[PDB]
Design a binder for these strands. Structure first.
Lengths: 178, 70
RNA sequence: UGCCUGGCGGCCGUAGCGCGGUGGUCCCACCUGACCCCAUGCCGAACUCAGAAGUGAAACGCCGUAGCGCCGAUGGUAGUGUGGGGUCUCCCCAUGCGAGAGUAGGGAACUGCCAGGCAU
RNA sequence: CCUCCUAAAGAGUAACGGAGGAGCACGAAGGUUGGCUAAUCCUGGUCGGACAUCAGGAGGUUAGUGCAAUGGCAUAAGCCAGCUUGACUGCGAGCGUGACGGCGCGAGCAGGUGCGAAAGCAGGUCAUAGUGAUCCGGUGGUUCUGAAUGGAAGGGCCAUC
RNA sequence: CCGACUUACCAACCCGAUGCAAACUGCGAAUACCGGAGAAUGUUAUCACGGGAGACACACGGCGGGUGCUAACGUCCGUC
RNA sequence: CGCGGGGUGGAGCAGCCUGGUAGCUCGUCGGGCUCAUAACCCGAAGAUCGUCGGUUCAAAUCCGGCCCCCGCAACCA
RNA sequence: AGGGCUACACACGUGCUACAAUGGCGCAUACAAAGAGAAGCGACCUCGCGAGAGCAAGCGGACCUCAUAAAGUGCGUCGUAGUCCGGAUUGGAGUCUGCAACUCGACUCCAUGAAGUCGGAAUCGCUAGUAAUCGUGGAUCAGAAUGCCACGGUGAAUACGU
């Protein structure tokens, strides 16, 4: 993926000196983007969960797979483990290529006020966000002309501060939230 | 990798330096340097002598007397 | 012969935790490649296989550290058998047994087999 | 009848004595092999709700356990998946238990089946509660047998209701 | 109203520290009990088989626990 | 410090046979309607299903404590 | 002098307007009555997207303007989609009278956007140039009606029975 190739070739060599590490093994990276698509209440309908799995079947070559209620406060018919979302855990080439569709073809999906939130980083290397609509990646420029549903995001990184979170992949043309 | 759709970049990254119906370089703000502020300060930022739509020039010599039509 | 590292054990835990210093192209871990054997809820994350480079960050490990877990006297004390005395709610004495907690002091484990690195 | 306490550190043990459970469930909630690991709180984001989820951190098992509760459980006795049906048949030294009928564990053998590379494991389910001895009534198998002889109602034996 | 300009007002989570428990433990006796070895003493103890029981309504007291009232010349049990 | 039944919106009553609020009817409220109101007619709202605690994804509904109402027990001699 | 008569989770009497298609929209296009105007009405012409303003013939109205009155007629287009309908609400800007348009006026332009799918118990006007339905003018009036008074256009259905 060109975003990761640029990040290792140009950005990692500068983060080395901006944070003045002793080892090249200290420089931050994204580990995984784990996802959820936590639409909820879908056990009473099933077709909503099948439609959310059909959006995730188009974000990556990877297969959709259910997320479930754990505290399960709402209730329907079955105890505890009723489904709420359809996940797809992306890593490496399958997450770096997706972030490269953002602001190149997904331009109507991403706004300045919906950019990267610089205050949402933490020194544990954990991050999360919502995008309120589905964003697909086909073999060509295409959109399924269907809406209603949306997606939420979960990310793990090797960053040991929230300031190194603000430096990781920060050279790309994706906006920042303000 | 139990692949269900195929990722390809050649149709979506070629000629992306410009803005068109198929792809755009960047979105609104950031790299596009868009401004989104609001302001007021009505009338007094301009010249205060402003006049309505009409057939005459500025500082004209006369005005037609409507009773003088007889 | 001594020092250091690795796999596998002994003990049955003053064998630990926290903190600080600090080390590795011996080993080790991070780590590179995935395509093949093998594999995933999807996922080369995990498991598996072919393994380059760089490093000592994490993980790993040694040393310093008595802050914490913790070892812990002597003596008294509680409890308790028997005998005598004896209060209604249980108790005193002679005599045999006698803690737990605390104080002082201590504690940063000890050790075996086999292989690797290093030294005259 | 089971568990904790009554119960007094070998052991047994009462009173309408204090608390809680049992009348069944499981063909997966069984065998076997490999691997995995929590309640809860904090952190982060929004269609995402409520206080609801994915991820990370702290917690370091509190959770989970077919069914209340104690004991026990990480080498898991908790949990997930492949193959599998030992939810074994004929037998059993020894130990534990009760007055006895009867009852719990079990060294170990032969047959036959299954897992695991193989060592190795498989007598159902973490163990204990889920009412039924004996006469008797029914039903399947049966050269074990059937009174003058041969068949036989019938009797016995085994299995089970 | 997200938020905040405010103390006048409550409590233990959490935390420092004191107090406490049949159905809490982190610690943990004495006295027993039972296997093994052993002296002296005990008229056979311990135990198998056989003939025969009587007994199944036990009680004030000491020491321990329940219950009642930390009542009973009470009541259930452990124990002499 | 016994036992059995009861505790529902303003008011009466159904329910539960272990659950997934709000039923039926009178009343109330606005509207049609009348000179006006009773009343017919149309439509809508209500509520800590005694209460606190327990079980559960979910409790008015199952279960324990407690408060309240009614009945039963409440001596033979 | 300023404020209020105009406030606001309500209800009603009476009126307006829409939900469209024998309707809307863009273009072409036909046939009226009536009424006001001396610090007033007003074409041609000029300026502006436009309200309107400038310039200015005419006139006191059988002499002029509103004015191609609109519905209707010709042509393209929409297919029931909350629309090519409705356009409340709401942002911005311009025009107007007047001492002055903040609460609280009228007109114009751009943009935005909601209920509404022909509506309960029920109810009202009308017998023909009537109702239904389309447009116009005036009083009152600095300015300012969807009410009131008057006007002309298109123009029904049905009337057994009592």
């Amino acid at each position: 993926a060109k975003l990761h190739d640029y990040y290792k070739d140009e950005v990692v060599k500068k983060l080395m000196t901006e944070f003045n590490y002793n080892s090249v093994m200290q420089v931050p990276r994204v580990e995984k983007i784990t996802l959820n698509m936590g639409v909820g209440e879908a056990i009473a309908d099933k077709k909503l969960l099948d439609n959310a799995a059909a959006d995730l079947a188009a974000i990556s070559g990877q297969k959709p797979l259910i997320t479930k209620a754990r505290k399960s406060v709402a209730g329907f018919k079955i105890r505890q483990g009723y489904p709420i979302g359809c996940k797809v855990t992306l890593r490496g080439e399958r997450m770096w290529e997706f972030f490269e569709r953002l602001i190149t073809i997904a331009v109507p999906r991403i706004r300045d006020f919906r950019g990267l939130s610089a205050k949402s980083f933490d020194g544990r290397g954990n991050y999360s966000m919502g995008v309120r609509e589905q964003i697909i990646f086909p073999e060509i420029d295409y959109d399924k002309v269907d809406r209603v549903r949306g997606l939420d995001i979960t990310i793990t990184t090797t960053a040991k501060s929230d300031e190194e979170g603000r430096a990781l992949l920060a050279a790309f043309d994706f906006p920042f939230r303000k | 990798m139990k692949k269900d759709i195929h990722p390809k970049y050649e149709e979506i990254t070629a000629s992306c330096s410009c803005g068109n119906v198929m792809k755009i370089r960047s979105t609104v703000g950031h790299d596009l340097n868009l401004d989104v502020c609001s302001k007021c300060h009505p009338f007094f930022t301009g010249k205060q002598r402003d006049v309505a739509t009409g057939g005459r020039v500025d500082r004209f010599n006369k005005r037609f007397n409507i009773p003088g039509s007889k």
